[PDB]
Scaffold this active site. Structure first.
Site, short mmCIF file in Angstrom:
data_model
loop_
_atom_site.label_atom_id
_atom_site.label_comp_id
_atom_site.label_asym_id
_atom_site.label_seq_id
_atom_site.Cartn_x
_atom_site.Cartn_y
_atom_site.Cartn_z
N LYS A 137 -13.99 -6.89 -7.84
CA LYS A 137 -14.44 -7.18 -6.47
C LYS A 137 -15.94 -7.41 -6.43
CE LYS A 137 -10.81 -4.27 -4.64
NZ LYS A 137 -10.52 -3.05 -3.85
N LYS A 155 0.84 -1.19 0.00
CA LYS A 155 0.00 0.00 0.00
C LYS A 155 0.88 1.25 0.00
CE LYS A 155 -4.06 -1.93 -0.21
NZ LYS A 155 -5.21 -1.56 -1.11
NA NA Z 1 -6.86 -1.71 -4.77
#
Ligand code: NA
Length: 325
Positions: free
Chosen positions: A244, A148
């Protein structure tokens, strides 16, 4: 046949931080549908970045109670509900309940054969470089690390993690954290560092520059992905997409989207929200045969469903019916 909505909180193993902020727990919503002695269940994760709230999602699910009691199908479900967390829950509960009643595994219905284990990415949270390097080093044996990023100064961060895991395939996710002024510098740095993929470098709707620069590393849309329909419009900017189920509003639409993304020549990543093994289970099915799978939700939690999915190292095994499907 009746339907219940349930909210459950799960503690994160520490904290989970992206460029947008930190989470210390994972609130999830389940839709449970019972038909006689049979039960189906589906999990979702309301995502405020997409305008969702826990009360909003629960309201949207509970409103399906009469329609589901009447005998609503997954097929009709795709018309009554918009994609998003709520439909994800209802859709996967139907997939589940249908599997339990028929005796035919959801896996086999989706894949035409049994599901198989696959390698999942493992996510290193955004923190100070030393911290990220330390967690990366502990996990340097994993084959795929997702890092991240997404600040105005990620060089120290990016350099530290590559050095901590010289052998890992590494993908970086900025969660919209970079801009027009630093993107070319970061792609060059990423290529020097042998990064495999970059997720959502620029904010959704402010990402036109991606169409006018070389991509030394494949660039993946996440936040910018909006159902099967807007896939074609994303080709000018992105080489890959992150699918997703909370975004597609369930397994049904996820398979439709995967078929179309493959037709359009996108590299496919199947990702997840910070959820439990219950949320991961249907996504394991969409992840079969894709370039990347990011299904590490339960590994980021301090407490997962029992029973849950088995993770052995970075290989995740497909759901047994005691869990889902
Ligand atoms: Na992502």
């Amino acid at each position: 046949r009746y339907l219940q909505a349930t909210t459950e909180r799960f503690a994160v193993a520490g904290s989970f931080t992206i460029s947008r902020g930190t989470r210390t727990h994972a609130d999830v919503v389940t839709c449970t549908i019972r038909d006689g002695s049979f039960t189906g269940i589906g999990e979702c994760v309301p995502y405020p970045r997409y305008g969702e709230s826990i009360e909003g999602v629960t309201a949207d699910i509970e409103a399906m109670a009469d329609r589901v009691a009447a005998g609503l199908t997954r097929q009709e479900l795709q018309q009554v509900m918009k994609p998003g967390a709520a439909r994800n829950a209802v859709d996967c509960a139907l997939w589940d309940l249908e599997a339990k009643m028929s005796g035919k595994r959801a896996a086999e219905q989706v894949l035409g054969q049994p599901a198989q284990p696959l390698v999942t990415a493992y996510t290193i949270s955004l923190a100070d470089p030393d911290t990220m390097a330390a967690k990366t080093a502990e996990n340097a044996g994993r084959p795929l690390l997702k890092i991240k990023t997404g600040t105005a100064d990620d060089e120290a961060r990016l350099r530290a993690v590559r050095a901590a895991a010289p052998e890992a395939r590494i993908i970086i996710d900025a969660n919209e954290g970079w801009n027009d002024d630093n993107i070319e510098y970061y792609l060059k740095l990423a290529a020097e560092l042998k990064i495999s993929l970059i997720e959502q470098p620029l904010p959704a709707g402010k990402d036109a520059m991606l169409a006018r620069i070389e991509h030394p590393v494949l660039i993946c849309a996440d936040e910018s992905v909006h159902s099967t329909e807007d896939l074609a419009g994303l080709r000018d900017r992105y080489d890959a997409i992150n699918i997703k189920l909370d975004k597609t509003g369930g397994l049904t639409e996820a398979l439709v989207m995967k078929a179309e993304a493959e037709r359009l020549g996108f590299t496919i990543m199947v990702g997840c929200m910070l959820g439990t093994s219950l949320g991961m289970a249907p996504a394991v099915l969409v992840a079969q045969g894709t370039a990347f799978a990011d299904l590490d939700g339960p590994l980021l939690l301090a407490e997962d469903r029992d029973p849950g999915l088995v993770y052995e190292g970075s290989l995740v095994y497909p759901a047994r019916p005691e869990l889902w499907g």
